């Protein structure tokens, strides 16, 4: 047996009124398949939604422990194993996911094999083991048949563009996803639907469409019970408030911290968001990570030093940043910091150049502001605001 089955049996023995409770929770709307799952191995609910919802209702503190057990005992050829592959990737449960992947690419079910190879390309691109070009070639050679993998083969590229600061391709690509074509696996349709809400929120943020950004993150929050998506929804809402509402930005990031207590990665992300927030508002900054050599954290060290005219320390940090490789969006922030430290308009022009290249219409407001404060000609600023980079 699996841990989850054992626990449900035990708990049912102590309290029968649970099954009705589970019945409504699992979307089973008929305790029948509940009985069948408990009593007979290999029984799976029609939708992975059912066991997920029960685990979250009855054993929320044990979700990972139980699901790693359940998922890694499923028949890899099944719809449950495919749904579990998406459950694992959505939650960033890379253990469940990678083992399910190496099992599915070997197996003899074509649907599971296809899911496995596509998610494999996603994980390899995410870990920078392959380039985007090689990912695209591999996806093409797979001759994808299922609508789910047609959608996810686009989603994985969107994740890559977002994480590499290459925002210009995203809007057109995300419009090409058609989730309504997914009819067999409602768990994957609904989870992918949340994925699209969160990605859309990020695209709107990068277009400086702030109200739409928050609308899509609200939709994401309503649509899911997956922590990962809740985290990035609060992150993006808070980011959208960075230049306007300090208290509400802070409140969204603090909400993120409160749901991140047991996840170090998500906690660090919200500390970074608060760090950036407090630098934008030139406040004393209690969130800086002084034990990091990532560009993200070092940049915020330099930003804070610049804000308080500790120019020697700022220069030492920018020296460190000089000896690290930057993407276009990261480089745009670098030139912004250099421009503020040196009071050098040419740095703000370079910052603007790289914000245009990454197609970041949100953070470009920082160098534009600085140029305006230094007395830049008005028509010129209007040109720098409105012209765009040819991609």
């Amino acid at each position: 047996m699996e841990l989850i089955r054992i626990a449900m049996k035990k708990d049912l023995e102590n309290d029968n009124s649970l099954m009705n409770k589970w019945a409504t929770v699992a979307g089973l709307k008929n305790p029948n398949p509940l009985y069948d799952f408990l009593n007979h191995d290999g029984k799976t609910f029609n939708e992975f939604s059912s066991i997920v919802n029960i685990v979250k209702s009855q054993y929320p503190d044990r979700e990972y422990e139980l699901m790693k057990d359940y998922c890694l005992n499923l028949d890899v050829k099944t719809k449950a194993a495919r749904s579990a592959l998406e459950y694992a990737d959505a939650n960033m449960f890379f253990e469940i996911e990678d083992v399910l992947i190496d099992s599915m690419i070997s197996c003899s079910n074509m649907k599971s094999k296809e899911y496995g190879k596509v998610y494999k390309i996603h994980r390899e691109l995410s870990n920078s083991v392959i380039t985007e070009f090689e990912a695209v070639k591999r996806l093409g050679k797979l001759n994808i048949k299922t609508p789910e993998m047609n959608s996810f083969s686009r989603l994985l590229l969107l994740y890559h563009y977002l994480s590499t600061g290459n925002f210009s391709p995203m809007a057109q690509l995300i419009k090409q996803i058609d989730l309504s074509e997914i009819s067999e696996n409602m768990y994957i349709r609904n989870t992918y639907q949340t994925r699209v809400h969160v990605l859309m929120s990020n695209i709107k943020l990068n277009e400086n469409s702030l109200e739409e950004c928050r609308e899509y993150s609200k939709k994401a929050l309503e649509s899911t019970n997956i922590l990962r998506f809740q985290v990035f929804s609060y992150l993006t809402i808070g980011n959208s408030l960075l230049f306007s509402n300090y208290e509400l930005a802070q409140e969204n990031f603090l909400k993120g911290l409160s749901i991140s207590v047991q996840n170090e990665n998500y906690n660090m992300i919200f500390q970074q968001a608060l760090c950036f927030l407090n630098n934008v508002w030139r406040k004393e900054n209690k969130w800086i990570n002084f034990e990091s050599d990532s560009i993200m954290d070092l940049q915020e060290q330099a930003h804070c030093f610049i804000n308080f005219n500790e120019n020697s320390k700022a220069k030492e940090v920018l020296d460190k940043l000089d000896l690290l490789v930057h993407n276009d969006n990261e480089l745009a922030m670098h030139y912004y910091l250099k421009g503020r430290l040196e009071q050098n308009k040419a740095c703000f022009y370079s910052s603007i150049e790289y914000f245009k290249k990454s197609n970041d219409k949100f953070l470009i407001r920082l160098p534009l502001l600085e140029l305006q404060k230094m007395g830049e000609n008005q028509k010129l600023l209007e040109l720098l605001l409105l012209l765009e980079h040819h991609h």
Partner: peptide
């Protein structure tokens, strides 16, 4: 920088 994610 500003953290981003989805």
């Amino acid at each position: 920088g500003m953290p981003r994610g989805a």
